């Protein structure tokens, strides 16, 4: 069933010999592979620039719109150091700030994306006034939507990411920890309350839902929320980490299909989607973080299973995007590489990149937003550039 959604993987698995072309014994990419990545990046950027001329003027979001393009260029500026990338980022930021709708709080789908990205861009351009104005607006954005959900695209962890994004890039605590703490407390309270209401408590002390479904994965579901709650950034107490989060994580682990993949919602029987948004490519982050925090082998073994499912069924007919595509899937290998230091996973990432280097030659469907960060080409370009320094690579708009 997964098989019907993926191309057969044409590549051999890792060995020291096959890997020599890609990186040295220190996991550092060869000059040759680096340059081939760079050449593809330059080519695709050309097509992206042209394609974006036809994009909807009104959508400034990180997920499908202008702020997402700015995310890419800030990244490219950091990777390559070319000033023209920072300038490109400026243009996209300006477009995005004209698109605030006041309807959502998240980095990916709300006003927090434009504002947080703008703060960082202005900062990088030594424009203190504009940077500080953006931070102010971002901080106050909290108020506009209480009773928001808890998930990534529309809920509280999506807003938290925006705050962390600012702090990371400024290198200082521009948004006070107390602001993050307050949101974290609301998430925990909400989780306990819903589990109590529905009598989940015995099997899962926390429970969350979005549009009246118990989503499991990174984009809308439990794996995304628990990944965040387990992050040192969010400063959940040891007490709550063990009494609330860990048993809830374990409940998710128990939902695993025999294949190693995960259902999109609790009770869903169809083992079909191998995406960041739904299934193993998104659930793996929770597993790896659980391993880092709790040091229980079961979490690591589950992560290995994810990587194997993705190696087999991860090259999607859906395309090359991040949310549900080969580049987003490839990030699962990098996260496991960065935990274990096992070059096998760096190798798998390089082969997924090899696939992306033949962009458009496989008969993949055209995305609804073909040039966007999460559905389209910007996300694929992001991944290729991030691979240049694998130890620093992070799935954008999500991974901490």
């Amino acid at each position: 069933h997964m098989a019907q959604r993926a191309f057969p993987n044409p590549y051999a698995d890792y060995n020291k010999s096959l890997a020599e072309g890609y990186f040295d014994a220190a996991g550092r990419l060869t000059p040759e592979f680096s340059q081939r990545l760079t050449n593809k990046i330059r080519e695709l950027l050309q097509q992206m620039e042209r394609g974006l001329k036809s994009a909807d003027p009104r959508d400034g979001t990180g997920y499908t719109g202008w702020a997402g393009i700015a995310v890419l260029y800030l990244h490219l500026y950091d990777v390559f150091g070319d000033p023209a990338y920072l300038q490109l980022a400026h243009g996209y930021v300006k477009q995005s700030l004209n698109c605030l709708t006041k309807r959502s709080i998240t980095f990916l789908c709300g006003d927090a994306g434009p504002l947080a990205v703008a703060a960082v861009l202005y900062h990088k351009m030594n424009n203190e006034k504009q940077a500080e104005d953006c931070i102010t607006r971002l901080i106050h954005l909290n108020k506009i939507d209480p009773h928001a959900p808890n998930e990534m695209l529309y809920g509280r962890i999506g807003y938290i990411y925006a705050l962390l994004f600012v702090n990371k890039n400024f290198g200082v605590e521009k948004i006070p920890q107390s602001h993050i703490q307050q949101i974290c407390e609301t998430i925990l309270t909400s989780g306990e309350n819903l589990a109590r209401k529905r009598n989940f408590t015995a099997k899962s002390p926390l429970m969350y839902e979005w549009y009246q479904e118990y989503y499991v994965g990174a984009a809308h579901g439990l794996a995304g929320i628990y990944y965040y709650l387990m992050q040192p950034s969010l400063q959940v107490s040891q007490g709550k980490l063990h009494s609330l989060v860990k048993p809830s994580v374990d409940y998710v682990c128990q939902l695993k299909f025999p294949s190693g993949n995960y259902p999109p919602c609790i009770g869903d029987n169809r083992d079909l989607l191998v995406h960041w948004c739904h299934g193993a490519p998104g659930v793996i982050y929770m597993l790896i973080q659980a391993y880092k925090v709790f040091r229980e082998e079961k979490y690591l073994c589950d992560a290995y299973q994810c990587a194997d499912v993705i190696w087999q069924y991860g090259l999607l007919k859906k395309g090359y995007g991040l949310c549900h595509g080969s580049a987003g899937n490839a990030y699962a290998f990098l996260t496991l590489y960065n935990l274990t230091q096992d070059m096998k996973y760096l190798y798998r990432a390089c082969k997924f990149a090899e696939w992306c280097l033949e962009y458009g030659e496989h008969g993949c469907r055209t995305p609804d937003t073909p040039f966007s960060l999460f559905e389209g080409m910007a996300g694929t370009i992001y991944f290729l550039a991030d691979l240049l320094v694998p130890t620093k690579a992070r799935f954008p708009a999500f991974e901490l």
């Binding site: 997920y63 499908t64 789908c109 695209l153 809308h220 949310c323 549900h324």
Partner: peptide, 6 residues
Amino acid sequence: GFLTEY
């Protein structure tokens, strides 16, 4: 569709 459907 809606953003991450099914």
